[model samples]
Target: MNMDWALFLTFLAACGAPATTGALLKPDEWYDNLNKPWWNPPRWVFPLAWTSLYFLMSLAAMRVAQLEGSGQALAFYAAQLAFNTLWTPVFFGMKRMATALAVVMVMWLFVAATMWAFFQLDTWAGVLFVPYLIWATFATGLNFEAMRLNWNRPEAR
Candidate 1:
């Protein structure tokens, strides 16, 4: 298969659409002070994991986008990205643990749906989302633990 440079770049930009939120809404002392579980991934893990996931999912999206009758796949892709974009802002910017948990729950659903949609069009495309789905699941659990531990008030400790 030939490299579709334009489509790849476009999908990368679409992935970056959610990434920019993570960039802008960074975790601060507020996040650090939260009572996170021992399973909470270290700080460095976020960007590393997300960046890798972004590139892979971009490839997945590019594959699906290049195919005919991929409208539903792309729609699910966009919806997940929208929820992904909202999550960082809710969690970091607003520092709303419960609200962020809510956002992540919806994000996980869309992510799962996106993967299934891509699978309907292409196996490799769906396979590419597996890491992303796993990460989202891990993140949801992490958020739940953080919310349960902190209850949105780091000072609660």
Candidate 2:
């Protein structure tokens, strides 16, 4: 197989590592009680949304990695992955909505940067990030609302 295909396959497998975060730190009763916005996505939307997003993300990262001089692009990919990995633990495991909001905000920026960097190398790679950007935007808004509504709640402490 060519390098691009090989890299794509590797990234596809690697994406599962971050995806597992949600599985392990699932939203339990504590999350169900939080004051969420009316616009918040239904519980069933999460796994489907994330599964699709991660598949696209892996494809994007693989394309970027195959390009010449992709060091910085790959770096952003890794950085965003790190932040993505942390978000689940911060929100569900620790019940720190405010902190989770901050983390996702940062993650949003990293995703944007990664998208831009990927665009410079491969248009398809950048395009793949569009859905992820939209998802993150919605997620950020959801996180913000959750924090605003539940700031005084015992779990936020």
Writing each residue's lDDT as its tens digit, candidate 1 over 79-144 gives: 998899888878777777788888999999999999999999999999999999999999999988
Residue 124 C-alpha lDDT in model 1: 95
User: What's the distance in Å from true for residue 112, model 1?
Assistant: 0.6
TM-score of 1: 0.93
Runs of candidate 1 with Cα error greater than 4 angstroms are: 152-157
Q: Give all candidates' CA lDDT scores.
A: 0.87, 0.86
- What shift in Å separates residue 99 of candidate 1 from its native position after superposition? 1.0
